[PDB]
Motif scaffolding. Structure first.
Motif, PDB file in Angstrom:
ATOM      1  N   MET A 163      48.158 108.160  45.464  1.00  0.00           N
ATOM      2  CA  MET A 163      47.942 106.827  44.912  1.00  0.00           C
ATOM      3  C   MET A 163      46.666 106.199  45.464  1.00  0.00           C
ATOM      4  O   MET A 163      45.927 105.540  44.726  1.00  0.00           O
ATOM      5  CB  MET A 163      49.149 105.938  45.206  1.00  0.00           C
ATOM      6  CG  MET A 163      49.076 104.556  44.578  1.00  0.00           C
ATOM      7  SD  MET A 163      50.564 103.582  44.868  1.00  0.00           S
ATOM      8  CE  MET A 163      50.118 102.045  44.072  1.00  0.00           C
ATOM      9  N   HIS A 164      46.379 106.421  46.749  1.00  0.00           N
ATOM     10  CA  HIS A 164      45.139 105.917  47.338  1.00  0.00           C
ATOM     11  C   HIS A 164      43.920 106.623  46.755  1.00  0.00           C
ATOM     12  O   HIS A 164      42.872 105.995  46.555  1.00  0.00           O
ATOM     13  CB  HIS A 164      45.180 106.085  48.855  1.00  0.00           C
ATOM     14  CG  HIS A 164      44.240 105.183  49.593  1.00  0.00           C
ATOM     15  ND1 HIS A 164      42.871 105.341  49.555  1.00  0.00           N
ATOM     16  CD2 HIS A 164      44.474 104.122  50.399  1.00  0.00           C
ATOM     17  CE1 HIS A 164      42.302 104.410  50.300  1.00  0.00           C
ATOM     18  NE2 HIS A 164      43.253 103.658  50.825  1.00  0.00           N
ATOM     19  N   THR A 165      44.047 107.921  46.463  1.00  0.00           N
ATOM     20  CA  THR A 165      42.962 108.663  45.820  1.00  0.00           C
ATOM     21  C   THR A 165      42.669 108.126  44.421  1.00  0.00           C
ATOM     22  O   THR A 165      41.507 107.861  44.070  1.00  0.00           O
ATOM     23  CB  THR A 165      43.318 110.150  45.759  1.00  0.00           C
ATOM     24  OG1 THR A 165      43.324 110.694  47.083  1.00  0.00           O
ATOM     25  CG2 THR A 165      42.316 110.920  44.910  1.00  0.00           C
ATOM     26  N   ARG A 189      41.015 104.641  44.725  1.00  0.00           N
ATOM     27  CA  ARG A 189      39.592 104.621  45.054  1.00  0.00           C
ATOM     28  C   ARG A 189      38.756 105.122  43.881  1.00  0.00           C
ATOM     29  O   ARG A 189      37.664 104.597  43.627  1.00  0.00           O
ATOM     30  CB  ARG A 189      39.299 105.415  46.340  1.00  0.00           C
ATOM     31  CG  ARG A 189      39.227 106.938  46.216  1.00  0.00           C
ATOM     32  CD  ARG A 189      38.780 107.650  47.487  1.00  0.00           C
ATOM     33  NE  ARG A 189      39.771 107.599  48.557  1.00  0.00           N
ATOM     34  CZ  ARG A 189      39.553 107.041  49.740  1.00  0.00           C
ATOM     35  NH1 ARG A 189      38.374 106.498  50.006  1.00  0.00           N
ATOM     36  NH2 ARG A 189      40.504 107.039  50.662  1.00  0.00           N
ATOM     37  N   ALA A 190      39.295 106.063  43.091  1.00  0.00           N
ATOM     38  CA  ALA A 190      38.561 106.522  41.915  1.00  0.00           C
ATOM     39  C   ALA A 190      38.520 105.459  40.825  1.00  0.00           C
ATOM     40  O   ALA A 190      37.490 105.291  40.160  1.00  0.00           O
ATOM     41  CB  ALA A 190      39.174 107.812  41.378  1.00  0.00           C
ATOM     42  N   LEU A 191      39.609 104.708  40.653  1.00  0.00           N
ATOM     43  CA  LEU A 191      39.619 103.640  39.662  1.00  0.00           C
ATOM     44  C   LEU A 191      38.714 102.485  40.060  1.00  0.00           C
ATOM     45  O   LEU A 191      38.045 101.910  39.196  1.00  0.00           O
ATOM     46  CB  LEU A 191      41.043 103.141  39.436  1.00  0.00           C
ATOM     47  CG  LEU A 191      41.764 103.660  38.190  1.00  0.00           C
ATOM     48  CD1 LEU A 191      41.066 103.163  36.942  1.00  0.00           C
ATOM     49  CD2 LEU A 191      41.851 105.170  38.176  1.00  0.00           C
ATOM     50  N   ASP A 242      33.654  99.538  39.143  1.00  0.00           N
ATOM     51  CA  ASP A 242      32.329  99.114  39.588  1.00  0.00           C
ATOM     52  C   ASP A 242      31.220  99.770  38.778  1.00  0.00           C
ATOM     53  O   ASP A 242      30.233  99.106  38.437  1.00  0.00           O
ATOM     54  CB  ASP A 242      32.134  99.428  41.067  1.00  0.00           C
ATOM     55  CG  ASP A 242      32.456  98.255  41.955  1.00  0.00           C
ATOM     56  OD1 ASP A 242      32.597  97.133  41.429  1.00  0.00           O
ATOM     57  OD2 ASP A 242      32.550  98.452  43.184  1.00  0.00           O
ATOM     58  N   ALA A 243      31.381 101.051  38.436  1.00  0.00           N
ATOM     59  CA  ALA A 243      30.382 101.733  37.623  1.00  0.00           C
ATOM     60  C   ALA A 243      30.323 101.170  36.213  1.00  0.00           C
ATOM     61  O   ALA A 243      29.244 101.112  35.622  1.00  0.00           O
ATOM     62  CB  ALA A 243      30.667 103.230  37.577  1.00  0.00           C
ATOM     63  N   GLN A 280      31.476 106.612  49.711  1.00  0.00           N
ATOM     64  CA  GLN A 280      31.524 106.527  48.256  1.00  0.00           C
ATOM     65  C   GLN A 280      30.131 106.226  47.729  1.00  0.00           C
ATOM     66  O   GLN A 280      29.387 105.454  48.343  1.00  0.00           O
ATOM     67  CB  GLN A 280      32.497 105.445  47.783  1.00  0.00           C
ATOM     68  CG  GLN A 280      33.893 105.531  48.368  1.00  0.00           C
ATOM     69  CD  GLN A 280      34.737 104.314  48.035  1.00  0.00           C
ATOM     70  OE1 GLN A 280      34.291 103.406  47.336  1.00  0.00           O
ATOM     71  NE2 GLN A 280      35.967 104.294  48.532  1.00  0.00           N
ATOM     72  N   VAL A 281      29.782 106.827  46.600  1.00  0.00           N
ATOM     73  CA  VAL A 281      28.499 106.588  45.950  1.00  0.00           C
ATOM     74  C   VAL A 281      28.737 105.721  44.713  1.00  0.00           C
ATOM     75  O   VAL A 281      29.480 106.136  43.813  1.00  0.00           O
ATOM     76  CB  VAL A 281      27.776 107.901  45.614  1.00  0.00           C
ATOM     77  CG1 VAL A 281      28.703 108.957  45.000  1.00  0.00           C
ATOM     78  CG2 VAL A 281      26.596 107.636  44.702  1.00  0.00           C
ATOM     79  N   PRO A 282      28.198 104.511  44.659  1.00  0.00           N
ATOM     80  CA  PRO A 282      28.358 103.689  43.458  1.00  0.00           C
ATOM     81  C   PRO A 282      27.460 104.184  42.335  1.00  0.00           C
ATOM     82  O   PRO A 282      26.287 104.506  42.530  1.00  0.00           O
ATOM     83  CB  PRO A 282      27.944 102.291  43.929  1.00  0.00           C
ATOM     84  CG  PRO A 282      27.028 102.539  45.072  1.00  0.00           C
ATOM     85  CD  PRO A 282      27.514 103.784  45.744  1.00  0.00           C
TER      86      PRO A 282
END
Lengths: 287, 49, 49
Positions: free
Chosen positions: B10-12, B15-17, B22-23, C47-49
């Motif tokens: 869930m933490h993975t 962080r991907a979401l 942000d992207a 992490q890379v934004p």
């Protein structure tokens, strides 16, 4: 009096697993400091192209030599021996030891070898240990390197080449070595050259100074040793200003003082009981 | 073992979401700039006009 | 007579790490031992934004 040593580079687990085999062996170091970086440790800092082996012997003679004791995380427990008390060593030399000899320490002659110290290297650095060989083989192989270097100036002839090929071999108990030439490609290494030059010129200075000094000495109380001395000189000859003689005698003494890594081989150990496989031996550190 | 692995997963995914969100907002900024620059004539044209 | 008026010992000012402002570039962490720590490595989760 315990020494430490740290490695700046990343040190793996295979390098420690091949280094800790060398758990009790000699590792000479240039200065008796309490903490020394590993670039100074060993003998890699001294080898180069032009200089050869007699330089290594001369700098190793005046260098202190210590004993490796234990390994840790990144500190290495070197331990300087004391005169009289007894320790254990290993045998990095290629000759099987026996009881009660006198070990010498000479620089190893396999420069660029087939063993290559187990690839125990770092970036542009490698560890190397000196051989620990008993004394008759030590001054034997000193004479072998010496008269291998003497024949090197006229080697175009072929019987002297077979003589050199005889000199390159060696004999001991179950031991055959092949000690390579000092000459590579029609030139000599400079420290080997100055060693053989120093001994040949002190021989010549004796040969043209004794015929002066038997007369400059024998006008005192003569002895039978003195007339037999001039007998030796005269059989040698019939077999065929202050400013110059002061330079002759000064050059005599200072050039015989450049063979001091050859004329005196100083003992550093006394062997005690040995192990099966003949790799380990308790011993008494002398000097 | 199972619950800690599912919380780690869930933490993975979290962080991907957050990286993707942000992207996307930086991409909205970037596409708005690239559609604002193809609407902007230089200063001398507007000053003359 | 030869007088001796006063004898003076210099009181040198002590200096510590965390009192110095150089510690702002340091996450100063004390371990217990490094006799076995050969390769003390830190991993990262950047992490890379």
């Amino acid at each position: 009096a315990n020494i430490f040593c740290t490695f700046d580079h990343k040190l793996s687990i295979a390098d420690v697993g091949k280094l800790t085999k060398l758990v009790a062996a000699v590792v000479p170091i240039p200065q008796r400091l309490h903490l020394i970086k590993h670039y100074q440790l060993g003998l890699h800092q001294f080898v180069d192209h032009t200089r050869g082996y007699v330089r290594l012997r001369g700098l190793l003679r005046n260098m202190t030599l210590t004993l490796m004791r234990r390994v840790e995380g990144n500190q290495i427990l070197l331990h300087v021996p004391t005169h009289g008390l007894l320790y254990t060593v290993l045998n990095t030399g290629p000759v099987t030891w026996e009881k009660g000899d006198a070990l010498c320490v000479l620089p190893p002659l396999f420069h660029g070898p087939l063993a290559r110290e187990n690839l125990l290297t770092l970036g542009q650095w490698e560890l190397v240990l000196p051989w620990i060989v008993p004394m008759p083989l030590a001054l034997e192989i000193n004479q072998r390197l010496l008269i291998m270097g003497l024949f090197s100036l006229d080697r175009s002839y072929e019987e002297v080449k077979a003589a050199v090929q005889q000199l390159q071999t060696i004999t001991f108990r179950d031991a055959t070595f092949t000690i390579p030439d000092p000459v590579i490609d029609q030139h000599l290494l400079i420290d080997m050259k100055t060693a053989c030059l120093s001994m040949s010129m002190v021989a010549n200075l004796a040969s043209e100074l004794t015929m002066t000094y038997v007369r400059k000495l024998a006008l005192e109380d003569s002895s039978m040793l003195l007339v037999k001395c001039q007998e030796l000189l005269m059989r040698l000859d019939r077999e065929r200003s202050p400013d110059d003689e002061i330079a002759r005698l000064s050059a005599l003494f200072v050039m015989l003082r450049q063979l001091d890594d050859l004329i005196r081989e100083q003992v550093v150990f006394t062997v005690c009981d040995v192990s099966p496989d003949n790799k380990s031996a308790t011993c008494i550190f002398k000097g | 073992l199972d619950k800690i692995l599912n919380v780690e997963a869930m933490h993975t995914v979290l962080r991907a979401l957050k990286n993707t969100a942000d992207a996307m907002e930086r991409g909205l900024i970037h596409s708005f700039l690239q559609t604002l620059l193809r609407k902007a004539p230089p200063y001398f044209v507007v000053q003359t006009l | 007579f030869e007088a001796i008026f006063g004898t003076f010992c210099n009181r040198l000012e002590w200096v510590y790490f965390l009192t110095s402002g150089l510690a702002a570039a340091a996450h100063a962490i004390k371990f217990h031992d490094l006799n076995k720590l050969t390769t003390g490595k830190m991993l990262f989760h950047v992490q890379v934004p």
